[PDB]
Amino acid sequence: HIDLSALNPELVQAVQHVVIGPSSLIVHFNEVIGRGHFGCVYHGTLLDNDGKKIHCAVKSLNRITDIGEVSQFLTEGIIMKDFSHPNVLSLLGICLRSEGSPLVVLPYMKHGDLRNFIRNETHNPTVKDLIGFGLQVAKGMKYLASKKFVHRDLAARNCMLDEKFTVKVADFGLARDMYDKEYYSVAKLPVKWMALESLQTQKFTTKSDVWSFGVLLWELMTRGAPPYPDVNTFDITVYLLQGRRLLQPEYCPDPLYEVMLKCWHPKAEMRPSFSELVSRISAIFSTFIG
Numbered sequence: 001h002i003d004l005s006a007l008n009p010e011l012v013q014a015v016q017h018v019v020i021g022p023s024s025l026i027v028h029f030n031e032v033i034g035r036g037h038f039g040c041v042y043h044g045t046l047l048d049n050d051g052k053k054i055h056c057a058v059k060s061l062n063r064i065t066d067i068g069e070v071s072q073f074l075t076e077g078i079i080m081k082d083f084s085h086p087n088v089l090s091l092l093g094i095c096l097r098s099e100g101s102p103l104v105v106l107p108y109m110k111h112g113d114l115r116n117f118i119r120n121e122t123h124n125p126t127v128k129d130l131i132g133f134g135l136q137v138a139k140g141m142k143y144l145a146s147k148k149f150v151h152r153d154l155a156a157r158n159c160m161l162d163e164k165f166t167v168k169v170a171d172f173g174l175a176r177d178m179y180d181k182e183y184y185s186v187a188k189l190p191v192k193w194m195a196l197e198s199l200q201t202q203k204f205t206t207k208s209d210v211w212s213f214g215v216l217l218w219e220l221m222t223r224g225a226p227p228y229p230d231v232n233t234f235d236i237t238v239y240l241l242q243g244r245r246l247l248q249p250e251y252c253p254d255p256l257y258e259v260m261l262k263c264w265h266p267k268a269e270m271r272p273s274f275s276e277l278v279s280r281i282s283a284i285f286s287t288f289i290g
């Protein structure tokens with residue numbers, strides 16, 4: 001029971017271009033992927049016009065009483081419609097119902113988020129595999145940067161992994177508190193992934209995404225260790241300003257660590273572009289047999 005008339009008409013227009021009729025979507029309410037303060041995600045089945053069943057994730061708000069929340073929720077989904085790249089999560093559509101929250105419907109990602117995948121001891125990715133995941137993230141980010149899209153929360157916890165081990169850059173947005181909320185510090189900011197200038201100004205750019213990408217590479221090379229295990233409540237800005245960076249992981253190749261240090265250049269202007277990152281990491285990846 002949202003009132004579409006109260007929303008920005010341009011937003012409603014965009015939503016209608018990706019509408020899923022409620023009868024085409026079955027939400028498995030008993031099968032919850034996650035729950036947070038603002039939202040929740042369920043398994044779902046989407047029927048296409050030919051009757052083919054598609055396994056999907058279905059994201060919902062917990063409340064629909066605040067127009068800002070409803071508008072932001074729909075806007076987050078609509079933003080994704082503008083993305084078409086193998087390493088960027090795509091939108092299946094948005095289901096508007098006569099009762100309750102609109103539903104944002106995403107393709108199902110078998111292996112969940114990249115951080116949970118690499119931390120899972122039942123999986124055994126090689127150093128080459130892990131570098132490959134990093135390369136895929138860089139390609140997704142190269143695409144997004146070309147669209148002048150600034151991510152603001154790039155981290156392994158926000159990237160998804162499908163059944164073919166394709167990494168999809170994503171962002172849980174309003175449902176980000178479902179998992180790993182403790183990495184957010186009071187604005188809720190992912191301080192251990194943020195560039196020095198962003199810690200100081202709370203402004204983000206593609207060059208600050210590059211810093212976060214460096215941290216993501218470190219996550220990959222440590223199979224999902226928390227960054228800066230030396231610091232919990234100690235101010236990360238002060239820590240960095242003492243002249244410190246994350247240490248080189250034991251199995252991180254020297255040139256990949258050099259890439260990380262470049263991503264953390266004190267001058268944003270001097271950090272490599274995602275184009276440069278894709279080129280450099282492709283070369284490093286290519287040196288591994290397995």
Ligand SMILES: CS(=O)(=O)Cc1cccc(Nc2nccc(Oc3ccc(NC(=O)C4(C(=O)Nc5ccc(F)cc5)CC4)cc3F)n2)c1
Pocket residue numbers: 033034041056057058059076077080083088089104106107108109110111112113116144151160169170171172173174175179
């Ligand atoms: C992640 S986990 O390991 O902790 C839990 C788990 C375990 C096993 C399987 C899964 N499968 C799964 N498949 C598809 C989606 C999904 O959850 C979502 C993953 C991402 C989102 N994304 C979004 O809501 C948005 C988004 O991703 N935007 C966005 C922003 C920038 C981009 F570059 C791309 C997309 C619109 C805000 C929404 C979701 F419901 N979850 C999930």
